[PDB]
Amino acid sequence: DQMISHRELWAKIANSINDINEYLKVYEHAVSSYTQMYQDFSAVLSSLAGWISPGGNDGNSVKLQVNSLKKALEELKEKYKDKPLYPANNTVSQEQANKWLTELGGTIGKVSQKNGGYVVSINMTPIDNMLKSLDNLGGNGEVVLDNAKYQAWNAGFSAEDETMKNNLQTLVQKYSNANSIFDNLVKVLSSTISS
Amino acid sequence: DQMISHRELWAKIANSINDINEYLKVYEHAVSSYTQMYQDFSAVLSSLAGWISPGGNDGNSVKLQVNSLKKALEELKEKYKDKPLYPANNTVSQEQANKWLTELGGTIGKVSQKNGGYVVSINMTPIDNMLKSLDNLGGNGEVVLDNAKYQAWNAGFSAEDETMKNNLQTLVQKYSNANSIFDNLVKVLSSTISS
Ligand SMILES: C[C@H](CCC(=O)O)[C@H]1CC[C@H]2[C@@H]3CC[C@@H]4C[C@H](O)CC[C@]4(C)[C@H]3C[C@H](O)[C@]12C
Ligand SMILES: C[C@H](CCC(=O)O)[C@H]1CC[C@H]2[C@@H]3CC[C@@H]4C[C@H](O)CC[C@]4(C)[C@H]3C[C@H](O)[C@]12C
């Protein structure tokens, strides 16, 4: 083709730098949103010790304060109902949301609707699973479980905690890799047209 | 400012592709070389299950084939004494091997001399630590260890295993990231050529 000027060359690069920055900011916001939710959830698990007391007359059953635990988990759900993983502002097409959902992890997000568009919500399945487990315990707002049943339910609570913690570390790793790839790509690209 | 032609822009991008390609070729041999080492060590790992057996008069202690394990580790160390991470063949400067040891991390390699020149050998210190820990167990071909002694020894053995495992994954992750830099640089070149 013809010639390209220095100004249009660097205008293309400045525009590409902005496009790369917006791409990396998607990972950064997804990490920050999921981190805040996991921190909120971890405070619920550490509060569990204060929501249980001796149950049977032998004293080796466990009385679970089910209404306290569900209220804490339900407030968790409502807090993040309108805090999507992507995008941080406004909405995108359903197809664009589906692509970013696969890019981040199918079990970490979930596509939902907003303002006539679509977003990638935080997948609340770990929270829904424990709200479901608590309702299957029955009871009068307070349930008395035998020791074997409490340890079984407690282990399921800790398994959901581990799933979310591993999801976060996976997302943190994807962000760190994307960061170093595109930080160095910009450094390479800037270095080689400057000289 | 000065105007550049499309062809000169292609050549600028192309020489960066060639620069990264030279970097990738050296980095790839270090990955395959260290992968082969850890794969051979995992062959020693799978044979360790058959080298421990009940050894107490009550069955409470652990009987370890310390000589078979020691000999297997020394053969692993001797197999890779002349197989360096860099260069793939011949030698290199002390300056050159020094900086390529820094680019590879410094933990996975060690600069050594080979007939006037220098190489970046595989750092076998995790294997040497295992050998001194085994030597500390004593015995004569086979040792009987109480449960406490076996668990302490196994924890140290596990830590050196995890050292090599983590060494490999950091190496693989950096190789993958540099490959993605290459791929995106190729996307840039392909786009500017078609434009
Ligand atoms: C995939 C993301 C966009 C993700 C999104 O939809 O928001 C885009 C945004 C910025 C994009 C890059 C912009 C610079 C480069 C432009 C080239 O012509 C093609 C490769 C590069 C390196 C792009 C690669 C990549 O296509 C990127 C990273
Ligand atoms: C820092 C990144 C790798 C990021 C990572 O995965 O850790 C590395 C990977 C490829 C590296 C380049 C390889 C080619 C060049 C080798 C030179 O001797 C030093 C500058 C160059 C241009 C390197 C620059 C940079 O050091 C790079 C981009």
Author numbering:
A (entry chain B), B (entry chain A): 126 to 147, 149 to 321
The authors write:
Like many Gram-negative pathogens, Shigella rely on their type three secretion system (T3SS) to inject effector proteins into eukaryotic host cells, driving both cellular invasion and evasion of host immune responses. Studies in Shigella have demonstrated that bile salts found in the small intestine (e.g., deoxycholate (DOC)) interact directly with the injectisome tip complex protein invasion plasmid antigen D (IpaD) to support interaction with the hydrophobic translocator protein IpaB and its stable recruitment to the maturing tip complex. In Shigella, IpaD resides at the extracellular tip of the injectisome where it functions as a “gatekeeper” that prevents unwanted protein secretion (leakage) through the injectisome prior to requisite activation events. Here, we uncover critical mechanistic details of the Shigella-specific DOC signaling process by describing the role of a π-helix secondary structure element within the T3SS tip protein invasion plasmid antigen D (IpaD).
X-ray crystal structures of DOC-bound IpaDWT and DOC-bound IpaDΔQ148 were critical for resolving this apparent conflict by providing the first molecular insight into the role of IpaD’s π-helix in the DOC-mediated Shigella virulence enhancement pathway. More specifically, comparing these structures shows that eliminating the π-helix does not eliminate DOC binding, but instead causes the single binding site for DOC to migrate approximately 10 Å, now docking in the cleft between the two central helices where the elimination of the π-helix occurred. A single DOC molecule is also located between the same central helices of IpaD Δ1–121, ΔQ148; however, the binding location of the DOC moved distally nearly 10 Å compared to the IpaDWT binding site, now interacting with the region of the protein where the π-helix once was. A closer look at the side chains located within 4.5 Å of the bound DOCs shows that while some polar and charged side chains such as lysine 137 and serine 141 in the native binding site and aspartate 144 and serine 141 in the modified site of the π-helix deletion construct are in the vicinity of the DOC binding sites, they are oriented away from the bound DOC and do not appear to contribute to binding through electrostatic interactions. Instead, both DOC interactions are driven nearly exclusively through hydrophobic interactions. We first looked within the native (lower) DOC binding site for structural clues as to why it migrated with the elimination of the π-helix and found that the deletion of the π-helix results in a subtle, but noticeable, 15° rotation of the N-terminal helix away from the C-terminal helix. This rotation likely reduces the affinity of DOC to this site as several hydrophobic side chains previously shown to support DOC binding are included in the rotation, but understanding the observed binding site migration also requires consideration of the alternate (distal) binding site that is formed with the loss of the π-helix.
